[PDB]
Design a protein around this nucleic acid. Structure first.
Length: 117
RNA sequence: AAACUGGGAGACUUGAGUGCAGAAGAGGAGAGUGGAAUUCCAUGUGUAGCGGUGAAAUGCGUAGAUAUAUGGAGGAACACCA
C-alpha cells in the first residue's frame, strides 16, 4: 500500500535494549520492531543478534509494501548499532546514508547520582 | 667625653608616591540578548510493549505508551575554544 519505495531507518540502541523503526521520507511510521518483541528477556536484549533479528522483522514488513531507498540515523550510544545495519542491507534494502544523531547538551541539565556498586 | 641611639636647625635621591607614553586580563555591579539539550503540552503516523538489574520486581501502557515528525511553554547551566 502507498508503494512508497523510499524512507529512512531510525535506530535507537541503549545499553539494555534496541529499537529499529523504519518510516518513510517524512514522519509517519510503517514498520517497527525491538528485541523485546522477539520473546527475548532481560540481559539478552542488548546483544547484537537481537538487533539482527529485529532489523530483519522490520525490513521483511517494510518491503512488503515496496521499499528500496533508505537512510540510517543512529541515536542511542549502545553496541549493536552496526549489526542492525548489516541486517538492514543483507535482507534486501538499499542503504545509502549513515548519520549519527546523538543529543549533546551544551552543558544545560544536571545528571543523576553516581552509583556506588 | 662626644662614636652610637634620642632632641633642634638645615641639605640630598637610591626607598615611597606623582606626572607623561604604552600593554594584558573568566576582577566587580547593572541592564538586555543567543543556541544545544531535558521536561510538559498540542497535532499527524503508528502497533504491543517500554523501562530497569549482578537477576528480578515496583512503575508507565490498548482512555493507545515507547518511537517518530512539526509547533509552543517555562526554568536552569553555558559543548568546542581550554
Amino acid at each position: 500500500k502507498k508503494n512508497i519505495e523510499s524512507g529512512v531507518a531510525h535506530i535507537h540502541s541503549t545499553f539494555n535494549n534496541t529499537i529499529v523503526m523504519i518510516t518513510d521520507t517524512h514522519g509517519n511510521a510503517l514498520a517497527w520492531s525491538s528485541a523485546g518483541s522477539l520473546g527475548f528477556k532481560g540481559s539478552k536484549k542488548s546483544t547484537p543478534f537481537a538487533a539482527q533479528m529485529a532489523a530483519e522483522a522490520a525490513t521483511k514488513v517494510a518491503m512488503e509494501h515496496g521499499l528500496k531507498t533508505v537512510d540510517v540515523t543512529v541515536k542511542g550510544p549502545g553496541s549493536g548499532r552496526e549489526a542492525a545495519i548489516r541486517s538492514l542491507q543483507a535482507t534486501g534494502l538499499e542503504v545509502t546514508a549513515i548519520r549519527d544523531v546523538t543529543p549533546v547538551p551544551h552543558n544545560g541539565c544536571r545528571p543523576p547520582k553516581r552509583r556506588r556498586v
